[PDB]
Amino acid sequence: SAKGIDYDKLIVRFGSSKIDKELINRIERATGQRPHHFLRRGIFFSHRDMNQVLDAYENKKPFYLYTGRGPSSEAMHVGHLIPFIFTKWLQDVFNVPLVIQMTDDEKYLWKDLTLDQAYSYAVENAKDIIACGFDINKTFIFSDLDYMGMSSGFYKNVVKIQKHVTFNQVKGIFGFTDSDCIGKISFPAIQAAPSFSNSFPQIFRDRTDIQCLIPCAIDQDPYFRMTRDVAPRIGYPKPALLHSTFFPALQGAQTKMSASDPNSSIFLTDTAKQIKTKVNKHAFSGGRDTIEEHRQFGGNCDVDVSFMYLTFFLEDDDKLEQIRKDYTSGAMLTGELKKALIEVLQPLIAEHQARRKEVTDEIVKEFMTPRKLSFDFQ
């Protein structure tokens, strides 16, 4: 479907629960802040135990944030930023510590990479993540390869989890086969491990009762569905989830943007010209065949990739609505909608590149150094 995938159905067959006006109102109530547009516009549409997190936050109880990034390469696209942009907002609004897993071991196992390459992509991607604005005093960005060997609790949990997840379970959840290397088969435990606070003793005082909130693209849910199942089996609380939709590929919402097909992506390193070019020449249009027909029948926002992008990056709700109405009425031609998006993306990407340029190795190193964060858990 050109309308993108059916998320309402995805929620159902996934067992998650939808983020309704009720939950969005509570989030605004508890925080006293207007909810981020990702929630208002349905971009972050699903969740698991978000009310629990809210209860905890409601009663001054602690909780922490956790997301990850598979460093497949030094090239990242705007799609990759969505969950991070949101996680950064969550960190500022709730003012909690954040844990960001860089699965360099995952990509070593799955791709034709060297340990050093994989590790090197984590460090490089971390600069982009730091460019999103995370507070150096409230966030630990770690590489699985490095951290496994310098944590008195990370591996211990990986093992616990490994004892409670069978090969059948992962064949059924992730689709592994008898031909997959043992590394792949047991990897899910690595990604599940950061859901438990005692995986990070340096930041949590050996405590294991701290609520964990995991914001992520819906495609990561199977790992945490599995995590939540074992949490009780090993005496730990279930991590909560906040699911986001996929950022659409240029060719159409039928697919999500993917570094695999570079033609469907707008990279964080693309020049202003390349951005303009990819949008004009490749962004699927919900507009009409001829401009005459466009003026007459108007465009279809529900399948127009450029409009969808504005939904993610145009913050002003009024300007977005105006644009929706004028495109739907024909008052605006896809060429203008296109130009409107381009004027939003170019600065968004240029600014990001400017931020990235500021994060030095000394800075990346501190972010990645296991340490006590400016929080007290006693």
Ligand X SMILES: Nc1ncnc2c1ncn2[C@@H]1O[C@H](COP(=O)(O)OC(=O)[C@@H](N)Cc2c[nH]c3ccccc23)[C@@H](O)[C@H]1O
Check binding of 70 to a second copy (CB under 8 A): no
Enter the tokens of residue 314: 């145009």
The region, left, alpha or beta by phi > 0 then psi within -120 to 50, assigned to residue 181 is beta
Rg (CA), the chain: 21
Check binding of 175 to a second copy (CB under 8 A): no
Of 63-71, 126-134, 157-165, 168-176, which segment contacts ligand X by CB under 6 A? Answer: 63-71
Backbone angles phi, psi at 96, to 5 degrees: -115, 160
Longest Cα–Cα distance of the chain, Å, equals 68
Map residue 244 onto helix, strand or coil. strand
Q: Which is nearer to a second copy, 189 or 240 (CB)?
A: 189
Q: Which is nearer to ligand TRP, 180 or 326 (CB)?
A: 180
Map residue 151 onto helix, strand or coil. coil
Instruction: Report the distance separating Cα 303 and Cα 314, nearest Å.
Output: 17
Check binding of 376 to a second copy (CB under 8 A): no
Check binding of 4 to ligand X (CB under 6 A): no
Q: Which is nearer to ligand X, 71 or 298 (CB)?
A: 71
Among 11, 50, 82, 240, binds ligand X (CB under 6 A): 82
> Nearest Cα to 91, choosing from 130, 124, 59?
130
Check binding of 186 to a second copy (CB under 8 A): yes
The least CB distance from residue 123 to a second copy, in Å, is: 15
Q: Which is nearer to a second copy, 180 or 336 (CB)?
A: 180
Instruction: Report the distance separating Cα 312 and Cα 85, nearest Å.
Output: 10
Check binding of 70 to ligand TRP (CB under 6 A): yes
Q: Which is nearer to a second copy, 189 or 345 (CB)?
A: 189
Per-residue b/e over 36-46, b at no fewer than 16 CB within 10 Å? bbbbeebbbbb
Q: Which residues, including other chains, have CB under 8 Å from residue 102's CB and lie 6 or more apart?
A: 68, 69, 71, 122, 125, 126, 141, 142, 143, 144
The least CB distance from residue 115 to ligand X, in Å, is: 17
Is 105:187 a contact under the CB 8 Å cutoff? Answer: yes
Of 62-70, 161-169, 312-320, 359-367, which segment contacts ligand TRP by CB under 6 A? Answer: 62-70
> Nearest Cα to 142, choosing from 198, 110, 99, 204?
99
Q: Which is nearer to ligand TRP, 134 or 307 (CB)?
A: 134
Instruction: Report the distance separating Cα 272 and Cα 243, nearest Å.
Output: 31
Check binding of 148 to a second copy (CB under 8 A): yes
Judged by beta carbon distances under 5 to 8 A according to partner kind, the member of Cl ion, a second copy, ligand X, none in contact with residue 150 is a second copy
Distances (CA, A) of 183 to 100, 171, 187, 294: 21, 14, 6, 54
Residues of the shown chain interacting with Cl ion in the complex, contacts defined by CB under 5 A: 7, 20-21, 25, 42, 45, 111-112, 234
Check binding of 188 to ligand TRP (CB under 6 A): no
User: Count residues contacting ligand X (CB under 6 A)?
Assistant: 20
Residue nearest to ligand TRP according to CB distances in the complex: 68
Judged by beta carbon distances under 5 to 8 A according to partner kind, the member of Cl ion, ligand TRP, a second copy, none in contact with residue 186 is a second copy
Which residues between 242 and 301 bind ligand X (CB under 6 A)? 244, 246-247, 256-257
Q: Where does this chain bind ligand X (CB under 6 A)?
A: 67-70, 79-80, 82-83, 101, 103, 191, 214, 216-217, 220, 244, 246-247, 256-257
Q: Where does this chain bind a second copy (CB under 8 A)?
A: 105, 108-109, 115, 145-146, 148-156, 159-160, 162-168, 170-171, 176-183, 185-186, 188-189
